[PDB]
């Protein structure tokens, strides 16, 4: 039996908007500590990992760990039917489908969506803890607009962490552009870094934006970037991007 009642339904709405565009199907691992999801996009250039802790939920119970394979396009479709102040409970039987119950925030009206669950052949992948050479924490809106702006200019962004602060650069037919950010923005450097990334993926990641007014970027020499959005102390959405080569 799984049952998880979340008061701020908006959270789940937005989490599902963020996933559905990067990926299409993904296995939600439900266990006693909370809800865990970790998948790559079709090309394997990007991964996302979602964590939602049990303490985030007004109620939460899980009897046997489980691993639900879900169409994320479909789930997000069902969720478009929850209002932004609705109270959403998910619910699944021991060993078939997923209830979603949406409760009117206060005035009573309840909705009951049932969706199937597809058999999915996913394998768990290991993220080897690492200390990053450069960590940037900036307002999430600002990062979204930078990826949006530079994507008008060229399809790649060169991200440069130096003493000063941090610079983003791109170029194409229109010309060249770069944007420099200095030190609410905090930079936490350790050995300057320069990397290049595909703006396409970054513009998918910034879809998590409504979840948080801040984002943190993590880089080291020749390793995948981490974009992270904290979800009001109940967890997060982490995205990883391999370096454009």
């Amino acid at each position: 039996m799984f049952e998880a009642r979340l008061v701020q339904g908006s959270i789940l709405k937005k989490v599902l908007e963020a996933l559905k565009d990067l990926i299409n199907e993904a296995c939600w691992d439900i266990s006693s500590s909370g809800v865990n999801l970790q998948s790559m996009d079709s090309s394997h250039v990007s991964l996302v990992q979602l964590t939602l802790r049990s303490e985030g939920f007004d109620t939460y119970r899980c009897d046997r760990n489980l691993a639900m394979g879900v169409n994320l396009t479909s789930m997000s479709k069902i969720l478009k039917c929850a209002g932004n102040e609705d109270i959403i409970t998910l619910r699944a039987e021991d060993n078939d489908t997923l209830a979603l119950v949406f409760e009117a925030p206060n005035q009573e009206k309840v909705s009951d969506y049932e969706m199937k669950l597809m058999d999915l052949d996913v394998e768990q992948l290991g993220i080897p803890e690492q200390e990053y050479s450069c960590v940037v924490k900036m307002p999430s809106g600002e990062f979204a607009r930078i990826c949006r702006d530079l994507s008008h200019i060229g399809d790649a962004v060169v991200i440069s962490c130096a003493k000063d602060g941090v610079k983003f650069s791109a170029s194409g037919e229109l010309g060249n552009g770069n944007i420099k950010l200095s030190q609410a923005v905090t930079i936490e450097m350790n050995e300057p870094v320069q990397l290049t990334f595909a703006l396409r993926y970054l513009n998918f990641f910034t879809k998590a934006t409504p979840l948080s007014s801040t984002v943190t970027l993590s880089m080291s020499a020749d390793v995948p970037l981490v974009v992270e959005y904290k979800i009001a102390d109940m967890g997060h959405l982490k995205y990883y991007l391999a370096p454009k080569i």
Partner: peptide, 11 residues
């Protein structure tokens, strides 16, 4: 070059 396979393995 491109994918995350080189940085993340099964297990």
């Amino acid at each position: 070059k491109h994918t995350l396979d080189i940085f993340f393995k099964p297990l």
